[PDB]
């Protein structure tokens, strides 16, 4: 399956949190292609900015094996 490597930064505008949030704030992650759409939306809704997106696995414009 196609996989996405995503780097994004998210700010906590609603509430101040005592516990360390640094992992949540800046998170380079591998996302399944199917999941990424929803994940991208979630980052946008948070007001976080997605710094970089790359397709880690799979071939672009492949009809099958996707």
């Amino acid at each position: 399956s196609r996989y996405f490597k995503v780097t994004a930064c998210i700010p906590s505008l609603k509430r101040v949190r005592t516990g360390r949030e640094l992992q949540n704030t800046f998170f380079t992650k591998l996302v399944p292609y199917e999941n990424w759409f929803t994940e991208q939306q979630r980052i946008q809704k948070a007001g976080g900015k997605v710094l970089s997106v790359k397709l880690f696995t799979g071939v672009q414009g492949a009809n099958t094996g996707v």
Partner: protein
């Protein structure tokens, strides 16, 4: 393909292929040569299968080729026949693969959404595929027809 499916299940389990899984692979490789011939037959008869199925579909559904209907007009009728041709090509691919996965990726995922935007009726498309099956069955030998039927049935099931 059968092989891809087996590998994927094994990888999820993080194990080497099970004996049972291996046996199914063995059966598939033996079947393959027969499968290739079945696919070849349909490819040769492709043009006629599409034509005959189209006519049957239009008789089955007068509405689709009517001024209201989506299929109506030369351009539109050609597109409807092109779609039938596409599905036939997919079915041939499926027979050689021994699995619906190749068919499924190209044709069955998002099909509802695509046709709804087009406003093409999904049931009519299914009828066309059924029609193609009947034509294809006649040209195929009985055992060959049964194999082909499964793939045809899957398509009909997928769009329903």
């Amino acid at each position: 393909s059968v092989l891809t499916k087996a590998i994927v299940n094994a990888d999820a389990e993080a194990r080497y292929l099970s004996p049972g899984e291996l046996d199914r692979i063995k059966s598939f490789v033996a079947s393959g040569e027969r499968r290739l011939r079945i696919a070849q037959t349909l490819t040769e008869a492709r043009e006629r299968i599409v034509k005959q199925a189209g006519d049957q579909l239009f008789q089955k559904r007068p509405d689709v080729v009517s001024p209201g209907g989506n299929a109506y007009g030369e351009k539109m009728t050609a597109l409807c026949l092109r779609d039938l041709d596409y599905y036939l090509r997919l079915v041939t691919y499926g027979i050689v693969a021994g699995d619906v996965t190749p068919i499924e990726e190209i044709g069955i995922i998002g099909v509802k959404e695509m046709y709804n935007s087009l406003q093409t009726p999904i049931p009519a498309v299914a009828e066309g595929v059924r029609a193609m099956k009947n034509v294809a069955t006649s040209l195929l030998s009985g055992d060959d027809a049964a194999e082909a039927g499964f793939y045809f049935d899957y398509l009909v099931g997928a769009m329903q």
